[PDB]
Design a protein around this ligand. Structure first.
Ligand SMILES: [Mn+2]
Ligand SMILES: [Mn+2]
Ligand code: NA
Length: 95
RNA sequence: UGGCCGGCAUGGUCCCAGCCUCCUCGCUGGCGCCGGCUGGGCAACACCAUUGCACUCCGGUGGUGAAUGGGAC
């Protein structure tokens, strides 16, 4: 069951050996060109490792980042991007 | 030694280089041998498991079962 467009893009299949701080840094490095980023959430917990939530200010950016970077080799692995099932709080607190 | 103990071996204090380690990374730490008990912590490192949709920090296990020489007194 696919997901509907969202301000936030959910990414997984990310190299799990990368420290949280760097992963956010590097993600920002390759995603900032698609639009203003409000935040990037990463957690190395058993359940949230290898995944990340890039929160774009404008949905169009999210869509671009999704179409263009899908499959992109990052830290030796192909990035698998989707739209986040639900809105991130940062977005809720506005729209 | 992370904390504690037993057997044995072993002249001494320094100085230079090298090497070692999860538990005060280095020169007012350590670098003979053998055996047993034992606590903390995943922070780093490694290994195992994990493809997982969050906005609550939170998987497990392992390491010391470690590291040599040189020189002045
Ligand atoms: Mn030590
Ligand atoms: Mn030894
Ligand atoms: Na861990």
């Amino acid at each position: 069951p696919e997901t509907r467009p969202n301000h936030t893009i959910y990414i997984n299949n990310l190299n799990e050996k990368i420290k949280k701080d760097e992963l956010k840094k590097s993600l920002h490095a390759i995603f900032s060109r698609f639009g203003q980023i409000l935040d990037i959430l990463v957690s190395r917990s058993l359940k949230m490792r290898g995944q990340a939530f890039v929160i774009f200010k404008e949905v169009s950016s999210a869509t671009n980042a999704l179409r263009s970077m899908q499959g992109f080799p990052f830290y030796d692995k192909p990035m698998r991007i989707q739209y986040a099932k639900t809105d991130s709080d940062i977005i809720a607190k506005m729209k």
